[PDB]
Structures are given as C-alpha cells and as structure tokens.
Design an enzyme around this catalytic site. Structure first.
Site, PDB file in Angstrom:
ATOM      1  N   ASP A  41     -46.927  11.603  -9.440  1.00  0.00           N
ATOM      2  CA  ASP A  41     -46.984  11.059  -9.680  1.00  0.00           C
ATOM      3  C   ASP A  41     -47.225   9.683  -9.035  1.00  0.00           C
ATOM      4  O   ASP A  41     -46.472   8.960  -8.037  1.00  0.00           O
ATOM      5  CB  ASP A  41     -44.656  11.520  -8.798  1.00  0.00           C
ATOM      6  CG  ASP A  41     -44.163  10.253  -8.738  1.00  0.00           C
ATOM      7  OD1 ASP A  41     -43.289  10.614  -7.964  1.00  0.00           O
ATOM      8  OD2 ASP A  41     -44.079   8.937  -9.659  1.00  0.00           O
ATOM      9  N   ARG A  89     -44.976   3.202  -4.105  1.00  0.00           N
ATOM     10  CA  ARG A  89     -44.263   3.934  -3.381  1.00  0.00           C
ATOM     11  C   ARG A  89     -44.363   5.127  -3.080  1.00  0.00           C
ATOM     12  O   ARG A  89     -43.767   6.160  -1.909  1.00  0.00           O
ATOM     13  CB  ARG A  89     -42.248   4.427  -4.161  1.00  0.00           C
ATOM     14  CG  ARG A  89     -43.290   5.138  -5.999  1.00  0.00           C
ATOM     15  CD  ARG A  89     -41.957   5.524  -6.235  1.00  0.00           C
ATOM     16  NE  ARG A  89     -42.317   5.884  -7.388  1.00  0.00           N
ATOM     17  CZ  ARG A  89     -42.500   5.670  -8.724  1.00  0.00           C
ATOM     18  NH1 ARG A  89     -42.702   3.875  -8.980  1.00  0.00           N
ATOM     19  NH2 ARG A  89     -43.188   5.958  -9.652  1.00  0.00           N
ATOM     20  N   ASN A  90     -45.083   6.058  -3.639  1.00  0.00           N
ATOM     21  CA  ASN A  90     -46.356   7.061  -2.932  1.00  0.00           C
ATOM     22  C   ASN A  90     -46.871   7.273  -2.001  1.00  0.00           C
ATOM     23  O   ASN A  90     -48.105   7.798  -2.299  1.00  0.00           O
ATOM     24  CB  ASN A  90     -46.171   8.513  -4.280  1.00  0.00           C
ATOM     25  CG  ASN A  90     -44.650   9.435  -4.506  1.00  0.00           C
ATOM     26  OD1 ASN A  90     -43.706   8.729  -3.689  1.00  0.00           O
ATOM     27  ND2 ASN A  90     -44.204   9.233  -6.039  1.00  0.00           N
ATOM     28  N   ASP A 129     -45.969  12.425  -1.584  1.00  0.00           N
ATOM     29  CA  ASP A 129     -44.404  12.084  -1.857  1.00  0.00           C
ATOM     30  C   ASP A 129     -43.571  12.331  -1.883  1.00  0.00           C
ATOM     31  O   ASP A 129     -42.965  13.562  -1.598  1.00  0.00           O
ATOM     32  CB  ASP A 129     -45.289  12.690  -3.596  1.00  0.00           C
ATOM     33  CG  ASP A 129     -43.418  12.853  -4.810  1.00  0.00           C
ATOM     34  OD1 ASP A 129     -42.516  12.258  -4.926  1.00  0.00           O
ATOM     35  OD2 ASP A 129     -44.164  12.432  -6.083  1.00  0.00           O
TER      36      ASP A 129
HETATM   37  F1  LIG Z   1     -51.684  13.244  -1.468  1.00  0.00           F
HETATM   38  C1  LIG Z   1     -51.191  14.329  -1.759  1.00  0.00           C
HETATM   39  F2  LIG Z   1     -51.824  14.928  -0.997  1.00  0.00           F
HETATM   40  F3  LIG Z   1     -51.234  14.624  -3.010  1.00  0.00           F
HETATM   41  C2  LIG Z   1     -49.883  14.473  -1.089  1.00  0.00           C
HETATM   42  C3  LIG Z   1     -49.561  14.918   0.498  1.00  0.00           C
HETATM   43  C4  LIG Z   1     -48.224  15.212   0.844  1.00  0.00           C
HETATM   44  C5  LIG Z   1     -46.900  14.782  -0.151  1.00  0.00           C
HETATM   45  C6  LIG Z   1     -45.748  14.981   0.078  1.00  0.00           C
HETATM   46  N1  LIG Z   1     -45.405  15.857   0.891  1.00  0.00           N
HETATM   47  C7  LIG Z   1     -44.754  14.916   1.949  1.00  0.00           C
HETATM   48  C8  LIG Z   1     -44.070  14.399   3.317  1.00  0.00           C
HETATM   49  C9  LIG Z   1     -43.615  13.292   3.865  1.00  0.00           C
HETATM   50  C10 LIG Z   1     -43.825  12.412   2.883  1.00  0.00           C
HETATM   51  C11 LIG Z   1     -43.089  10.767   3.472  1.00  0.00           C
HETATM   52  C12 LIG Z   1     -44.120  10.423   4.821  1.00  0.00           C
HETATM   53  C13 LIG Z   1     -44.786  11.201   5.682  1.00  0.00           C
HETATM   54  N2  LIG Z   1     -44.975  10.570   6.605  1.00  0.00           N
HETATM   55  C14 LIG Z   1     -44.573   9.333   6.750  1.00  0.00           C
HETATM   56  N3  LIG Z   1     -45.102   8.259   7.552  1.00  0.00           N
HETATM   57  C15 LIG Z   1     -43.962   7.918   7.447  1.00  0.00           C
HETATM   58  C16 LIG Z   1     -42.670   7.566   7.077  1.00  0.00           C
HETATM   59  C17 LIG Z   1     -42.592   8.209   5.636  1.00  0.00           C
HETATM   60  C18 LIG Z   1     -43.365   9.405   5.262  1.00  0.00           C
HETATM   61  C19 LIG Z   1     -44.575  12.271   2.015  1.00  0.00           C
HETATM   62  N4  LIG Z   1     -44.725  13.398   1.206  1.00  0.00           N
HETATM   63  C20 LIG Z   1     -47.623  14.747  -1.890  1.00  0.00           C
HETATM   64  C21 LIG Z   1     -48.917  14.810  -2.158  1.00  0.00           C
END
Ligand SMILES: FC(F)(F)c1ccc(CNc2ccc(Cc3c[nH]c4ncccc34)cn2)cc1
Length: 326
Positions: free
Chosen positions: A187, A191-192, A205
């Site tokens: 994904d 946005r991610n 994500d």
């Molecule tokens: F890049 C990777 F490693 F693939 C990866 C790392 C982390 C994830 C999912 N975990 C998370 C946790 C919180 C968030 C939102 C989030 C984290 N930090 C922020 N700072 C400001 C606003 C929103 C946020 C998103 N994904 C999914 C994929």
C-alpha cells in the site's frame, strides 16, 4: 471481519518450493520483549488519525530515549469496539516491525505496551504529517529554479525540484530496505508517507487508523478495499504481490509526487473500462514538474512484465546520480 476490508496488510515472504515465495504468517514471528515500555510513562495528546476500529494519537513518552527526557511519539491502538481479528492484526504489525529493524526512511518502532490493557504500538512522530496533504498544501508555493525568492510569500518553506528529487530518493531507499528484509508493503502511496524534521520522509501505513470506507482511493473489489490505482496489473487481476508490484506502486507515488499531490488517472474512474485500459497498456503521461529521467523511472516501474521493472536498489543508484549531477 474480513481484514482486507479494513486495511492492506504488508507481508513478509520466505522461500518456498523452487523459485517461489510464500507469505509468512506474521502471528508466528516473535515479539521481542526488549521493546516493552511502561504504559504509565505515556501521556496522550491529539488524535493523529482514526478509522472504524483503530487510531493513532500523539503522545509524550517519559524516558523512552534518554533516562531524564520526555519525547513526542505517535501511538497506534484500537478502539474498544474492535474485534479479536483487529487485536491480532495489531500484534502482528508489531511483530513485523520488531522483525524489520531500524531505517532512516521508515516510521520506526520505539516501544510497545502489550500487557494489562490494549496493545499500544509506539512509533516515531513526524511533525509535518502525511506527504500527500503536505504536497497539496504546498502546491501553489512550488518555486521554479532561478525565480526570485521575493516571488514566493514564504520562500524558506516553499517546495522546489530539489525537495521532490530528495523525497523520491528517500522513499526508494526505504523501500530498498524493506525489500532487503523480504517485506512487501502492498500500500505504498503518498498518503502512507510522512514528513519530519529536516524534510526526512518516512514510509508507514495508517492501516486501521485510516477511515478506509470513506477514502475513495480504495475501491471495493471482491471482499476487499484495494488501492487499485496504485496496484500492478498482476496484483489486481491475479492477486500476485511481489517486490516488483511494490515497484509499480512506487512509480505511481512518483507520479503523485511530481504532480504535487494530484490524483492518479484523472477522468478514469475505477470500473471495467479502467481495467481494460490498464491491460491494453494505458499509462499516465509525465507530470509537469517531473524531470525527464524521473519520468523514465516511472515508465519502467509500469512495465507490464514485472521482470523488466527496475529493483529498488537500481532506483536508488539511478536517483543518486541524478541528484549528484545537479
Ligand atoms: F515503512 C514501513 F516500515 F514499511 C512501515 C512502518 C510502520 C507501519 C505502520 N505503523 C504505523 C504507526 C503509526 C502511523 C501514523 C503515524 C506515525 N507517526 C506519525 N506522525 C504524525 C502523524 C501520523 C503518524 C502509521 N503507521 C507500516 C509500514
């Protein structure tokens, strides 16, 4: 709950028979208790995102990094209406994070709280939020090379081509890191991706902390809500996902990025006509602000044949040189 209706789950793959790969069941991965952090040492602030069953909230964490200091973090957690399937998914997400390890260009795991009450996943906080909405807010402030600073209102916070090339590089580096740990995001999109101090981009994500049903970038297809306009043909049509299908998404990301947050495939709603066109080889044109060599990367990311797509490792080496040559 069919989990595909609520988020696109990343996958770690392992070698199977012959040259095949199979998905690892993430529940099987270990959770290293070295990450465990006292729930009491968190202080919750504003909500950073929420979906039906999950949320991410900004918090202050006492002594997380230095024994005597508080620091700002983002915590992912579930609402009490969540089901066991969501609770499992969140532990599984923490396990994959524990497995992956640390990289400058991903949103990193800092800690977790897994006993007592709900699972809290503590990650790095990114002060500028998601890249999509950052680009969109900055769009009218894009500064051309060799144009006066006086032409912009706040030139020091404007956006220029060097920023765009930097973001493209940083995202390729983070995806190269993922691929190197046998991880497929599934994904990848603006946005991610988040933006933080020093204009560092971090992949993430929102997942269950995204209101997926109300985001028209996800389409109901089968028993899932899928980011179709970001997906490789083999993923749409055959549910095949590989490091090369992440590369296709990366090409779509590049398109968003150089279009300053425009929506992909304008005038092409997702419907049987969309799918026919993608199969026939319809591809997006160069964005206004994309350098020719960056558009060349896009086109190769969108090769119908996954073998002819570049790997993330090649993309990094390619953009590295573009940046150097400027
Ligand atoms: F890049 C990777 F490693 F693939 C990866 C790392 C982390 C994830 C999912 N975990 C998370 C946790 C919180 C968030 C939102 C989030 C984290 N930090 C922020 N700072 C400001 C606003 C929103 C946020 C998103 N994904 C999914 C994929």
């Amino acid at each position: 709950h069919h989990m595909p209706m609520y988020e696109v789950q990343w996958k770690v793959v392992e070698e199977s028979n012959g040259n095949n790969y199979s998905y690892i069941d993430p529940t099987q991965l270990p959770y290293d208790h070295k990450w465990e952090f006292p729930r009491n040492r968190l202080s919750f602030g504003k909500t950073l995102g929420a979906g039906a069953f999950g949320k991410v909230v900004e918090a202050t964490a006492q002594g997380l990094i230095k024994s005597d200091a508080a620091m700002t973090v983002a915590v992912k957690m579930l609402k009490p209406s969540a089901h066991s399937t969501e609770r499992e998914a969140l532990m599984s997400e923490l396990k994959v994070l524990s497995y992956l390890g640390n990289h400058e260009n991903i949103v990193n795991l800092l800690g977790a709280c897994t006993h007592g009450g709900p699972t809290l996943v503590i990650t790095e906080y990114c002060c500028y939020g998601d890249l999509l909405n950052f680009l969109r807010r900055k769009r009218d402030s894009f500064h051309s090379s060799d144009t006066s600073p006086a032409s912009m209102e706040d030139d020091e916070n404007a956006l220029d081509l060097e920023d765009l090339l930097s973001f493209s590089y940083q995202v390729a580096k983070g995806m190269a890191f993922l691929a190197s740990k046998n991880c497929i995001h599934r994904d990848l999109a603006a946005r991610n991706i988040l933006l933080t101090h020093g204009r560092i981009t971090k992949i993430c994500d929102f997942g269950l902390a995204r209101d997926i049903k109300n985001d028209s970038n996800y389409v109901d297809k089968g028993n899932a809500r899928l980011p179709v306009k970001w997906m490789a043909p083999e993923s749409i049509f055959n549910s095949v996902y590989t490091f090369e299908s992440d590369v296709w998404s990366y090409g779509i990301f590049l398109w968003e990025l150089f279009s300053l947050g425009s929506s992909p495939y304008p005038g092409m709603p997702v419907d049987s006509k969309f799918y026919k066109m993608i199969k026939e080889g319809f591809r997006m044109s160069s964005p206004e602000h994309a350098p020719a060599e960056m558009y060349d990367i896009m086109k190769t990311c969108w090769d119908a044949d996954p073998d002819k797509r570049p790997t993330f490792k090649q993309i990094v080496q390619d953009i590295e040189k573009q940046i150097s040559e400027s």
